[PDB]
Amino acid sequence: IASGKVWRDTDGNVINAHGGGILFHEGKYYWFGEHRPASGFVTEKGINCYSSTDLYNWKSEGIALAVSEEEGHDIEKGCIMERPKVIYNAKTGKFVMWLHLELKGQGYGPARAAVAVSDSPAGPYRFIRSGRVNPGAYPLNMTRKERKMKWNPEEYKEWWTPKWYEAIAKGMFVKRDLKDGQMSRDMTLFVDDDGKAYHIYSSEDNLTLQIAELADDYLSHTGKYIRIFPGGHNEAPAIFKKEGTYWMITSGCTGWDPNKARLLTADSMLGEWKQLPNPCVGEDADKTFGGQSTYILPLPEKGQFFFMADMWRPKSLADSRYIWLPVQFDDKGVPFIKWMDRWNF
Ligand SMILES: OC[C@H]1NC[C@H](O)[C@@H](O)[C@H]1O
Ligand SMILES: [Ca+2]
């Protein structure tokens, strides 16, 4: 595992799986990610999939979720498809893919999460629906008093004033988006011990993280959700659970530029969360080693976890590389990550 180098599949082609994540099923790891083009930023293809027995040799499984050729479809060619994650639904036996969708020709405005389904890990997946999250429902931890407040859009046009920040903290953008549902851009998924799944996403114009419970088949949301770190600008969330504790690594919001990772922790997924120091340590840790969090893969057979990131090259996004590093734990059980040029499982 040689972070930042050109990685190739078994045919010799550059692995094209960005913003991704990995699952294990029937003896194989399946890596899902954005198919990025050589020029431009929008996918020409959809969500790509690769498979491996060993986490070193990756076989191209082809496109798992394709862009549609039908005009007016939510996922017609030219839509934005980012940060795909796949989870297995044990009750129905289906593979469920969620992803950040922006409708074609609308930039990043729609701020939707989309959901697709497959009988097999590699696909093809069948698109079901897209939309903002939980129309009509308030966050669980947004208080009665906060829900009763009125925010005149004309008084709060200037971002980053003291009164605007306070307003964002007390849920001004939640109320703004209440009817049509909460915004979802950068996102991930987590399947808990009891089969409860959660959709974690940057919401409220990227200012605030939200964690939403998924329904029992993982195809919709239940209405139950919380919001955390309002105004915190936590992006590209990555999550894992260890010995009952939930840990989340995120980035800041500086477009393509690498920035300082944050470490967030809770004892309950929908309980209170708190922020801990940058979990990256050593030289370049202030820049997350030139990367941005995408996924934390548990290896539950070994009681270990590994941190996946993207080393984004905005000049040509197909040339973006992959940083994969062991998650280590200090004497208090707090995760940290150090660079290694080459390491083995
Ligand atoms: O918009 C480009 C880029 N910005 C930063 C996000 O974390 C990425 O997923 C991607 O949307
Ligand atoms: Ca955020």
CA distance 64 to 277: 37
For residue 234, say whether it is annotated as part of any ligand binding site.
yes
Q: What is the distance in angstroms between the CA of the first residue and the CA of the last residue of the chain?
A: 9
CA distance 106 to 114: 16
Phi, psi dihedrals of residue 93, rounded to the nearest 5° = 75, 20
What range defines the domain where residue 239 resides? 1-345
Return the SS3 of 290.
helix
* CB-based contact 249:236 (threshold 8 Å): no
For the chain, the residue count is 345
Residues with CB under 6 A from ligand 1: 19, 82-83, 186, 235-236, 255
Nearest CA to ligand 1 atom 8: 186
Reference 37, options 313, 331, 301, 328; nearest CA is: 313
CA distance 273 to 264: 7
* CB-based contact 211:198 (threshold 8 Å): yes
**Structure determination technique employed:** X-ray
Q: Any idea what the Cα angle at residue 121 is, between residues 308 and 320, rounded to 5°? A: 30
**Resolution in angstroms, to 1 decimal, for this deposition?**
2.0
Nearest CA to ligand 1 atom 7: 236
Structural domain count of the chain: 1
* CB-based contact 47:67 (threshold 8 Å): no
Classify residue 268 by burial, with Cβ atoms within 10 Å: 0-12, 13-18, 19+.
exposed
Sheet containing strand 335-337, strands side by side = 292-299, 304-311, 321-329, 335-337
The two tokens of residue 11 are 């045919």
280's CB contacts (< 8 A; 6+ apart) are 260, 261, 286, 288, 289, 336, 337, 338
20's CB contacts (< 8 A; 6+ apart) are 31, 32, 33, 34, 83, 84, 294, 295, 308
Taking the centre of ligand 1 as the mean of its atom positions, its distance from the CA of residue 257, in whole angstroms, is 10
Taking the centre of ligand 1 as the mean of its atom positions, its distance from the CA of residue 289, in whole angstroms, is 17
Q: Any idea what the Cα angle at residue 20 is, between residues 124 and 1, rounded to 5°? A: 115
For residue 131, say whether it is annotated as part of any ligand binding site.
yes
Q: Which of 235, 249, 315 to mutate to test the pocket of ligand 1 (most atoms within 8 A of CB)?
A: 235
Taken in order 199, 218, 177, 147, is the CA torsion positive or negative? negative
Return the SS3 of 50.
strand
* CB-based contact 251:293 (threshold 8 Å): yes
Taking the centre of ligand 1 as the mean of its atom positions, its distance from the CA of residue 205, in whole angstroms, is 13
Name residue, tokens 């976890």.
305
What CATH number did the domain enclosing 251 receive? 2.115.10.20
Reference 185, options 123, 151, 153, 233; nearest CA is: 233
Name residue, tokens 């083995």.
344
Reference 33, options 267, 320, 231, 254; nearest CA is: 320
Q: Which pairs from 314-318 meet CB under 8 Å and 24+ separation?
A: 314/255, 314/256, 316/38, 316/39, 317/18, 317/36, 317/37, 317/38, 317/40, 317/41, 318/14, 318/16, 318/36, 318/37, 318/38
